[PDB]
Amino acid sequence: KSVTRRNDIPEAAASPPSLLSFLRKNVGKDLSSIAMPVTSNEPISILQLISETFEYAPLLTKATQRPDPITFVSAFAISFLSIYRDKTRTLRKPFNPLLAETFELIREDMGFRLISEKVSHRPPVFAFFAEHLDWECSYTVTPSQKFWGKSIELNNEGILRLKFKTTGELFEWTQPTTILKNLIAGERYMEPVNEFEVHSSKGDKSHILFDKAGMFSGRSEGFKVSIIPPPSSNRKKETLAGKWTQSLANETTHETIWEVGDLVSNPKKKYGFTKFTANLNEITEIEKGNLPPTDSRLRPDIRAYEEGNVDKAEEWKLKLEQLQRERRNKGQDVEPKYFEKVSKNEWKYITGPKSYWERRKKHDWSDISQLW
Ligand SMILES: CCCCCCCC(=O)OC[C@H](COP(=O)(O)O[C@H]1[C@H](O)[C@@H](O)[C@H](OP(=O)(O)O)[C@@H](O)[C@H]1O)OC(=O)CCCCCCC
After folding, report:
1. Considering just the CA atoms, what is the radius of gyration of the chain in Å?
2. For the region OSBP-related domain (ORD), what residue ranges are annotated?
3. Which among 273, 112, 298, 83 has a CA at the least distance from the CA of 178?
4. Burial environment of residue 310 by CB neighbours within 10 A (0 to 12, 13 to 18, 19 or more)
5. Which residue among 21, 23, 29, 33 is best mutated to probe the pocket of ligand 1, counting the most ligand atoms within 8 A of its Cβ?
6. Can you list the positions of beta strands (E) in 72-134?
7. Which helix (H) or strand (E) holds 41?
8. Are 320 and 299 spatial neighbours (Cβ–Cβ below 8 Å)?
9. Residue 138 belongs to domain spanning
10. Nearest Cα to Cα of residue 127 among 135, 138, 112
């Protein structure tokens, strides 16, 4: 089966507030558990944003069918940055999910399904588990930001663990650091920095290094990828090149490996969302009547905001956070249901008759309370 999607969202209802305003105005001790106005947000939660890591999942599927899978895993690993190609996307942030808030994403068109949940509030910890017939990926991430003085260091702390269900081979990597520049003057934007690597359980390793731009060619967008197989295996060295804002190719044969999809129409007036982004908060035939009470698609503030009601959304954002606060203080902390801690910084999808997907088949959410 298949479903129809909006591939669009209403235009932004308010202009973007300044981030540096909050920084200096809120230095004192130091941010984190400091609230921000709803207008500083884009119409999706962090759970949904991280889900965009899978916009180009077909790359992983193709990887399971190529003698040199790491080159495609490397394309996928870098692909997520493309959502920041239209600078507008860097002007706002996702809504902060409530503890135990969830987000499921089933893309039958791409043959995969994903389930995610906020497993911790302080520090904030998000757990993801994506599934496809030929692969699966788990992720325990903690987004961290650090005011560097004239810019902000953005890092998703955590290892993405990819697994080929075809052969059981494993791939791991941490998403690369990004820097939000032009906090002072000029139009804000983000660009990746330094480098990161994708390591294979079979020894193969991929090294990605982003070009540098400190004061001239504006935003950095190019990058090189050096594939390095284990000297011993029949596999051999390869090289890739491209721009995380457009595409990646095998630089030896100059063949395109990955390309960006489409942004929504008139992106500058719609947070710079890609079409995939715009489809994240839509309730289609897939979700209709199948969601637990905690999915991000059911949040009132995000919904009202998406539909343009600033005041109404602001009312709701304050309400949701206040309620979580009271539950917290009463010690009636809502505990995550679909992931369990396996170690420090590591959560794992709970399997069984009480797992997410099993409960879903029979709408078994009797023990699940409304968070708002
Ligand atoms: C790489 C992936 C990108 C992900 C970007 C993530 C950016 C980020 O989490 O910061 C946002 C925060 C402010 O949140 P805010 O919306 O008011 O969320 C609420 C507050 O944290 C509030 O204190 C809390 O109540 P508490 O009192 O009960 O805890 C509520 O439960 C929360 O809902 O400000 C800061 O910590 C400063 C950092 C600024 C950086 C911005 C980047 C755009």
Report:
1. 21
2. 18-358
3. 83
4. middle
5. 33
6. 93-95, 102-107, 112-120, 125-132
7. strand 41-45
8. yes
9. 1-372
10. 138
Residue with the smallest CA separation from ligand 1 atom 31 is 321
List, in order, residues 6 or more apart from 211 with CB less than 8 Å away: 220, 221, 222, 223, 224
H helix and E strand count, the chain? 8, 19
In the numeric block, which tokens belong to residue 322? 């206040």
Q: Is 145 helix (H, G, I), strand (E, B) or coil?
A: strand
Ligand 1, residues at Cβ distance < 6 Å: 31-36, 46, 93, 96, 143, 145, 152, 154, 156, 321, 324-325
The residue whose C-alpha atom lies closest to atom 36 belonging to ligand 1 is: 32
Count up the domains in the chain and report the number. 1
Inter-residue contact 124 to 147 (CB < 8 Å) = no
Contact in structure between 130 and 364 (CB atoms under 8 Å): no
3-state secondary structure of 355: coil
First to last CA, the chain: 33
8 Å CB contact between 200 and 171: yes
CA 314 to chain centre: 24
111: number of Cβ within 10 Å: 15
Please give the method by which this entry was determined.
Answer: X-ray
Pocket of ligand 1, candidates 34, 87, 144, 189: which has the most ligand atoms within 8 Å of its Cβ, to mutate? 34
**Residue in the structure block whose two tokens are 């003698």:** 67
Q: What pairs with residue 303 in β-bridges? A: none
Ligand 1 atom at minimal distance to the Cα of residue 50: 2
Is residue 296 classed as helix, strand or coil in its secondary structure?
Answer: helix
DSSP lists the bridge partners of residue 144 as: 155
Which residue is listed with tokens 């606060």? Answer: 325
Residue with tokens 């791409």: 110
Q: What residues have CB less than 8 Å from 191, skipping those under 6 apart?
A: 178, 179, 181, 210, 213, 219, 220, 221
